[model samples]
Target: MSIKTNVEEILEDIKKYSPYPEKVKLVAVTKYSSVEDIEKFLETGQNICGENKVQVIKDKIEYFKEKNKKIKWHFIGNLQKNKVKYIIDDVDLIHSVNKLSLAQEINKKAEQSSKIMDVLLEINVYGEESKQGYSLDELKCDIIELQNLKNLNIIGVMTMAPFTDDEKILRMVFSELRKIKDELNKEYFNNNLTELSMGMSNDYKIALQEGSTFIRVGTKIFK
Candidate 1:
């Protein structure tokens, strides 16, 4: 019921299910949380936070700064090109770099900040039009363009599984993302495509099982 217990349990759960348990990172998604919520999480010694909005992430960054605390930030939602300038200085990993245009903007901004930005390619593994990411075919092509983006590091792949409770669907989407990560690495990024940011609050257990290196847990930790 407590945030500390939630963080500990999530880590323990990762150990139980994920084959690469040490590689599995639990990103406490603070998309719906406040400064107080993040403070509680920090007390547990888990410092990474995932945020969905540019404004909110910046505000939290300021709040934590005043308190003399540092946090690793992950932008886990569909990031806007215009907003990339605002978050360029703070975000540790940009998890939704789906297109070359977006990647270019981020690279431009990162270079301006004189920092290399780490990012993941978002993949719509299930072909759901409602989601925003790259298709496997498009992602493969996009990787070539990404090679020239000097300010950005192409780290891994990110995908969202369907909301339904169907384990079959969850399994398929997560595993497919992981497989694409492997194939992309073998042919292109060398071994840099190491992270699979799949799974969220509800399906994270299965996601850890399917080789997700980063699971974005929100309400499960905050609620």
Candidate 2:
């Protein structure tokens, strides 16, 4: 099947599990995709795409711009402090603000660019040893301080569930993320916390069922 066909099929699958299918945003994870593959996906009228590395996004930004295509680029990897400046103006959203110091750096660069950077607070819900994000306890404690960084807008939370076929664990992770978003909204912003960027190609259906507003899909569509 062609890339467009694969993407359309995935969109159909998303609707099966998404209560609000129209409200769910699909961000194509283009980390392993070539510029040609990305162009094929974009030709299908899906404009939002995600990249893992800062330099790749920087390189692709120019490529897409030259083609006269409007793409909403999302920074969806472990962002380092020094590279923050490179993407501060380019990314439509940053999906990995895992720490206060990183958020602070984003704010500093965003201020320099005179732009507010939209970001999702990455949550290490299962306390995974390898992942980068605040634990639930840490998120609750420092959210107030995080809010003070005026240049960085906290849209919502993003989480990566443990890579497993066990549906129970996947649901638990996605459910917990939704719960955290709910609690944060009730406690802080009165249900203003939007954009739950959970679920990748492997578990997006589960994520959607658990109130994920944004789903990042990659291999399933791009392969």
Candidate 3:
């Protein structure tokens, strides 16, 4: 199917099973698509786009900024602590803040640039030893430390379940992350702990059912 046709179908699917109202933001993941492909998606009323790599998005950033178009950019891939400076001022949200050092680097860079960055604390819900996210056991401790960073605002949590087609496992993973967020929120009175950045092209409906406010969709939007 064409990209436009595919996006329409995804939107229809979103509306069909979303647990919340229709105001949820559906971010179109734009890693492998061309600028033309992204623009075509923008034309279809999508204003948010996510790039998994900072370097790959350099040219696209210039293209979009030159046009004076309003687009929200999200860095959704595992980011290096050193590369935080390169993207600190450019993107609207960073979804892979998986470690204290990375969060601190982003905070330091954002402070230097006089910008406040919205971040999601990524949790390894499936506990894969090779994964990049912090596990549920590590969240509260990390959040306590990271929350003290003056420049970084923790808005939510992001997680990926182990590759599985089982709907029950998908929902369970999402629920576990949300539960962690809720428990932490109770301990920290000031943080609201909002955005649940779970779900992807395959299991977003399940993510939504478990209270995902932001769904990251790529192949569904790009294909």
Candidate 4:
């Protein structure tokens, strides 16, 4: 199937179970995926795309600009403090604000741009030490603290589970994020805490069923 065909099929399948109508944002994560593949999806009205590396997106920004495509870029990769200066000015959203140090760096750069950066608190739901997210227990306290930082806004939460085909395990991860969001919502009145930016090609169906508002789907659309 073509990229458009696959995306349409996925959306249609999702609608069968989604409680919300079109509330989910399908961010096409283009890391390691080709530009030609991205362009095809863009032409088909896939407006949101995510990149893992700042320099990779920066290098290709001119090409995207030449096409006059107004796509929303998401920084879903593990970010370095030094690299903040490069991407803070470009992306529409930053999904992997994993640490206080990185958030401080982003705040510094965002100050120069005079823009409040929108971000999702990436949670290490499965507690993988190699991954970059706070534990669920630390999430609430971290958000309350991060909310006070200038030029940064906590919009939602993002997470990843151990790669598994078991729907029960995947759904449990999404449920955990929802629980965190609900807890934070009680104290943080200004923040929406509505977006659950979880799941990918493998677990999105389960994520949606468990209340995901934004899903990062790639290979299904790019391959």
Which number leads on TM-score?
Answer: 1
User: Number of backbone collisions per candidate, in order?
Assistant: 0, 0, 0, 0
Query: What's the C-alpha lDDT at position 56 in model 4?
Result: 94
lDDT of 3: 0.84
lDDT by residue (1-223, candidate 4, tens digit) is 6888988877875786566847788888888777787888888877788999888988767678887878788988889999888888778889998888788888888988999999888888877878789876665556656877779877898997888988888877889888878877887745477688988997888888888888888887777
- Candidate 1, 1-223: lDDT as tens digits: 7999989889889989999998988899998888888899989999889998888888888888889998999999878999998889988999999899999999999999999999998888899869688988887777777999999998888988779899998898888888888898889988888899988889999999999999999888989
Tell me the TM-score of model 3: 0.93
lDDT tens per residue, model 2, 53-167 = 9889999999988989889999999999999988888899999989888999999999999989999999999887896888888777887889999998898899988789998
Best by lDDT: 1
Could you give the C-alpha RMSD of every candidate to the true structure, in order shown? 0.9, 1.1, 1.6, 1.5
Off by over 4 Å in 4: 189-191
What's the candidate order when arranged by decreasing TM-score?
1, 2, 4, 3
Model 1, residue pairs in steric clash: none
Worst 10 residues of 1 by lDDT: 136-145
Scored against the true structure, residue 136 in model 1 reaches a CA lDDT of: 84
Model 1 off-target regions past 4 Å? none
